[PDB]
Amino acid sequence: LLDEGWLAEARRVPSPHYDCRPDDENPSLLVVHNISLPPGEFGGPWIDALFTGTIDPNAHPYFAGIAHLRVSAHCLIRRDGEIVQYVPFDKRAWHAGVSSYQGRERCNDFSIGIELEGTDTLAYTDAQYQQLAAVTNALITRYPAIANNMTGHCNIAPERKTDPGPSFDWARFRALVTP
């Protein structure tokens, strides 16, 4: 629960993949993503590896093509609910790419990116909903603007991204937020 940009309860995997939010800006937007490495598979160390710039391109055919990436998110929430944090919330994680929200581009600058392990068409787990909510509630306490600004990657990069997809139950998530 927020200690110097770090979720107190999260497993910390500090990533070299971050820089500054221009103008010391407080984030105001929560972007929900999904991810699975390799695609459709859960449980590997590969998301940690990708988001820290250490992935083995030879470990899977799919990895060769993404080894060139320099990306990250603030948090990943695994299928069992485990929260792993890579980037302090005050800092700029590299998760949104080319994007626009309410006419403002470069969404990394002012957003917090949280990844749900999963896919567009498979239900996310009960733990995942409870934990995303706990994190979101923590964030809103620090950054009340986030209550008003919660979106999918597919919403700020339409026709580039589809996550977190139809499988993400906004109703369920909202019911758990700001209680």
UniProtKB/Swiss-Prot annotation:
Changing D163A: Loss of activity. The gene is ampD. The active site is at E115 (proton acceptor). Its EC number is 3.5.1.28. It comes from Citrobacter freundii. Zn(2+) is required for amidase activity. This is 1,6-anhydro-N-acetylmuramyl-L-alanine amidase AmpD. It is found in: Cytoplasm. Zn(2+) binds at H33, H153, D163. Belongs to the N-acetylmuramoyl-L-alanine amidase 2 family.
